[PDB]
Chain A
Amino acid sequence: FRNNYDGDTVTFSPTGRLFQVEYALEAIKQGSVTVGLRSNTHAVLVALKRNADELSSYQKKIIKCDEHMGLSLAGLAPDARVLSNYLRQQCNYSSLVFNRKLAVERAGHLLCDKAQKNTQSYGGRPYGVGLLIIGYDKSGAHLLEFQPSGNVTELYGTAIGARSQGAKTYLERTLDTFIKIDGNPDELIKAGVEAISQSLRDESLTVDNLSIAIVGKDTPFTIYDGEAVAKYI
């Protein structure tokens, strides 16, 4: 079975599956955990940075795409660089040509289509990374989840990566609570750190290990790392 239909992205299995896409999705699951959640005034990204050795650094997982948009990655880093770079350009085009900040919903559609092209053609490969996009546009705070399959969804909160399921159930529970953390960023972040720690097991989020990013009403997308996150551990 499978082995005969997972050679490339241009082949359907007898049941209508695309194994190369599914294998790419597997790279995400193997990726470190990251969480996203938003209220009505802000959107926050909390990510667990993973390190190779105790002599290495903890690879960044948050990329700023524009003053009002940014994302967190889980999986192949290079593929995140590519996708975020495309996103940086789309945001840029919107401003330069229309003097308009790109709507998070549109950014999601653009990403979906860019990924879709690498799943119907020969020679290419699906992207092997998941992304969580947060942003504040003309319709408030937003959070999107991007999967290599090309599927992008808007949520109040979510998580991806290894053991992400923990944090996700927590948010699905804490929903009515954080969705109302309006006008108070520190609370939204704390609520995020709490959701993410619901996926810990190995260790505990340290200073050079935790990474947080926020954007909102009067807050340009900014990334906090190290000493800057100390007050949240």
Chain B
Amino acid sequence: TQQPIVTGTSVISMKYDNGVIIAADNLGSYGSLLRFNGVERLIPVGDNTVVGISGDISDMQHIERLLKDLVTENAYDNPLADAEEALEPSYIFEYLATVMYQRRSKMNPLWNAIIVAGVQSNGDQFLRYVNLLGVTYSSPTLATGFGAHMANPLLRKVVDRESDIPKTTVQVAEEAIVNAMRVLYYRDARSSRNFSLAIIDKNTGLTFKKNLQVENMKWDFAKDIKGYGTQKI
């Protein structure tokens, strides 16, 4: 049993017709201190999988080492390591889910919320979540922490059910994701303006965008607001 120290906030994601999109800002909080700003919380595994992590950063780094090892180990005595026998997003997830549940079962959890996004070898999209309790679930859209409360409602307006997937394009999806990130920047006190976004498309492959920034924010209406009730000036 422990307590998170340096933490990463929301991780949001959704799937579109040709793949999945996942994003997460670059902040590493220390309580209410916005302590670190160059933290990458999206971990690419191979070229068909990206793992988004929130929660304790020290544990995130541990999961990173684990993922690198998975790649190294899968390459051993594997002549088809970059072909038929490369790591599938589902393998990477089942692995992490296993670890997450074993650790909570030993009363020593990896204090994180994880979302594994990718495209299977047969082209199928992959989006599944696992957290410190070992709980897992899939949905056309998935978000952790604050994003679960504010991103999902927005992302679900694009893909409310399975049949909305084929009707959604990368442009629509990426736009929804970028807007959600802005909303989270407005209301989440542990969020950052800088973030990374990655797309895993069954045709274009893995696109990993770094250093994005929330833009087009509305703040002007603030000038009109004064006092907290009766004040006029």
In the assembled complex, how far is the CB of residue A68 from the closest CB belonging to chain B, in whole angstroms?
A: 14
Kindly state whether residue B94 has any CB partner on chain A within 8 Å: yes
Chain A residue contacts of B98, Cβ below 8 A = 96-97
Tell me the smallest distance from the CB of B27 to a CB of chain A, in Å: 32
Those of B81-123 within 8 Å (CB) of chain A = 84-85, 88, 90-91, 93-95, 98
Tell me whether A117 is interfacial, beta carbon within 8 Å.
Answer: no
Complex CA gap A96/B91 in Å reads 10
List residues of chain A with CB within 8 A of the CB of B79.
Answer: 105
Q: Flag if B84 contacts A97 (CB, 8 Å).
A: no
Chain A facing B: main interface SS: helix
Question: Which residue of A is nearest B88, CB measured?
Answer: A100
The distance from the CB of B69 to the nearest CB of chain A, in whole angstroms, is: 13
What are the residues of chain A within 8 A of B33 when measuring CB–CB? none
Contact B85 A99 (CB under 8 A): no
- Is B77 part of the contact surface with A, judged by Cβ < 8 Å? yes
A173 within 8 A of B: no
- The digit string for A87-116, where 1 denotes a CB below 8 A from any CB of B, is 000000000111110010110010000000
A138 at interface by CB-CB < 8 Å: yes
Q: Which residue of B lies closest to A109 (CB)?
A: B77
In the complex, whether B80 has a CB less than 8 A from a CB of chain A is yes
Q: Are B91 and A138 in contact (CB under 8 A)?
A: no
Q: How far is the CB of B40 from chain A (nearest CB, A)?
A: 25
Residues of B within 8 A of A109 (CB): 77
Residue-wise interface mask of A (187-200) relative to B, using a CB-CB cutoff of 8 A (1 in contact, 0 not): 00000000000000
Tell me which residues across on chain B come within 8 A of A96, comparing CB atoms.
Answer: 98
B77 & A99 in contact (Cβ 8 Å cutoff): no
Using Cβ atoms and an 8 Å threshold, which residues of chain A touch B94? 97-100
| Contact between chains at B84 and A99 (CB < 8 Å) | no
Interface size class of B (residues with CB under 8 A): 10 to 19
In the complex, what distance in Å separates the CA atom of A133 from the CA atom of B94? 27
* CB 8 Å contact bits of A111-146 with B (1 = contact, 0 = none): 000000000000000000000000000110000000
Q: Which residues of B contact A138 (CB under 8 A)?
A: 80, 84-85
Does the CB pair B80–A139 fall under 8 Å?
yes
Q: Which residues of A contact B88 (CB under 8 A)?
A: 100
B95 touches A97 (CB 8 A): yes
Query: Are A98 and B91 in contact, CB atoms less than 8 angstroms apart?
Result: yes
CA distance A106 to B80 in the complex (A): 11
Which of these, B77, B78, B91, contacts A100 with CB under 8 Å? B91
Interface string of A144-158 (1 = CB under 8 A from B): 000000000000000
Considering the chains assembled together, what is the distance between the CA atoms of A25 and B27 in angstroms? 62
| Nearest chain B CB to A89 CB, angstrom units | 16
A140 vs B124: C-alpha distance in the bound complex, in angstroms? 21
Contact of A139 among B85, B90, B95 (CB under 8 A): B85
Chain A: CB-nearest residue to B86: A138
CA distance A98 to B80 in the complex (A): 17
Q: A106-B77, A139-B80 are in contact. Are A98 and B85 (CB under 8 A)?
A: no
Measured between beta carbons, the chain B residues less than 8 angstroms from A100 are 88, 90-91, 94
Residues of the A chain whose Cβ atoms lie less than 8 Å from the Cβ of B90: 99-100
In the complex, per-residue mask of A56-88: 1 if CB is within 8 Å of any chain B CB, else 0: 000000000000000000000000000000000
Q: Could you jot down 26 A-B contacts, CB within 8 Å? A: A96-B98, A97-B95, A97-B98, A98-B91, A98-B94, A98-B95, A99-B90, A99-B91, A99-B93, A99-B94, A100-B88, A100-B91, A100-B94, A103-B78, A103-B85, A105-B77, A105-B78, A105-B79, A106-B77, A106-B78, A109-B77, A138-B84, A138-B85, A139-B80, A139-B84, A139-B85
Binding site for B on A (CB under 8 A): 96-100, 103, 105-106, 109, 138-139
**What are the 6 tightest A-B residue pairs by CB atom distance, in nearest-first order?**
A99-B94, A98-B91, A138-B84, A139-B84, A100-B91, A97-B98
Known: A106-B78, A109-B77, A138-B80; 9 extra A-B contacts, CB below 8 A, are A97-B94, A97-B98, A98-B94, A100-B94, A103-B78, A105-B77, A105-B79, A138-B84, A138-B85
